[PDB]
C-alpha cells in the first residue's frame, strides 16, 4: 500500500484497483460524488442506500483520511484505502459504530466531481 500522508506515518495507504480517466484531480471545495464499500478490519455500503455519496472535499465533512485520499483520485478510479485511527475516529473512537483506535478499510469509486 502507498502512504499518501504528509507526515509519512503510514496513516493512510492506497492501492489503485481500477485506473481512472482524464488528468484533473479534484480540487479543495469540489462537490465530489462516490460509491463506497467500507468496513473495520461492520460493513457499510452506498449500494445499500441505492444512492451515491456526496460531500464537499477538504471541508472536514468526512474523516481526515477521506479528504486526503479522495483528493488523489481521478474520475472513474476505484481505490482501496487503509486507515490508522488518527486519520479516522481516533482514540476517542466514535461509538457505537467505531471503537477506540480502530483501523478502517474502504473500497472507493470516484464517479464524478464538479465545481464549488
Ligand atoms: C460514525 O458513524 C458512521 C460512520 C460511517 C457511516 C455512517 C455512520 O453513521 C452516520 O453512516 C452511513 C453514512 C451514509 O449516509 O452516513 C453519512 C456519513 C457521515 C460522515 C461524516 C462520517 C460519519 O463518515 C465518514 O467520514 C466515512 C467516510 C464516508 C463514508 C462513511 N464513513 C464512515 O466512516 C462510515 C463507517 C461505518 C462503518 C464501517 C466503516 C465506515
UniProtKB/Swiss-Prot annotation:
The modification N6-acetyllysine is found at residue 7. Widely expressed, enriched in testis compared to other tissues. It comes from the Eukaryota. GO terms for biological process: chaperone-mediated protein folding; protein folding; response to alcohol; response to bacterium; response to cocaine. GO terms for molecular function: FK506 binding; heat shock protein binding; peptidyl-prolyl cis-trans isomerase activity; protein-macromolecule adaptor activity. Keywords: Acetylation, Chaperone, Cytoplasm, Isomerase, Nucleus, Phosphoprotein, Repeat, Rotamase, TPR repeat, Ubl conjugation. Its main location: cytoplasm. GO terms for cellular component: cytoplasm; cytosol; extracellular exosome; membrane; nucleoplasm. Induction: By androgen. Immunophilin protein with PPIase and co-chaperone activities. Component of unligated steroid receptors heterocomplexes through interaction with heat-shock protein 90 (HSP90). Plays a role in the intracellular trafficking of heterooligomeric forms of steroid hormone receptors maintaining the complex into the cytoplasm when unliganded. Acts as a regulator of Akt/AKT1 activity by promoting the interaction between Akt/AKT1 and PHLPP1, thereby enhancing dephosphorylation and subsequent activation of Akt/AKT1. Part of a heteromultimeric cytoplasmic complex with HSP90AA1, HSPA1A/HSPA1B and steroid receptors. Upon ligand binding dissociates from the complex and FKBP4 takes its place. Interacts with functionally mature heterooligomeric progesterone receptor complexes along with HSP90 and TEBP. Interacts with NR3C1. Interacts with Akt/AKT1 and PHLPP1; enhancing dephosphorylation and subsequent activation of Akt/AKT1. Interacts with IFI44L; this interaction modulates the kinase activity of IKBKB and IKBKE. Interacts with IKBKB and IKBKE. This is Peptidyl-prolyl cis-trans isomerase FKBP5. It comes from Homo sapiens (Human). The gene is FKBP5. The chain holds residues 22 to 140 of 457 of the full protein.
Amino acid at each position: 500500500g502507498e502512504d499518501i500522508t504528509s507526515k509519512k506515518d503510514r496513516g493512510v495507504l492506497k492501492i489503485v484497483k481500477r485506473v481512472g480517466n482524464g488528468e484533473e484531480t479534484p480540487m479543495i471545495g469540489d462537490k465530489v460524488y462516490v460509491h463506497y464499500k467500507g468496513k473495520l478490519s461492520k460493513f457499510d455500503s452506498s449500494h445499500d442506500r441505492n444512492e451515491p455519496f456526496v460531500f464537499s472535499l477538504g471541508k472536514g465533512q468526512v474523516i481526515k483520511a477521506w479528504d486526503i485520499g479522495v483528493a488523489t483520485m481521478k474520475k472513474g478510479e476505484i481505490a482501496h484505502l487503509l486507515i490508522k485511527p488518527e486519520y479516522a475516529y481516533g482514540s476517542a473512537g466514535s461509538l457505537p459504530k467505531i471503537p477506540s483506535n480502530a483501523t478502517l478499510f474502504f473500497e472507493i469509486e470516484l464517479l464524478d466531481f464538479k465545481g464549488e
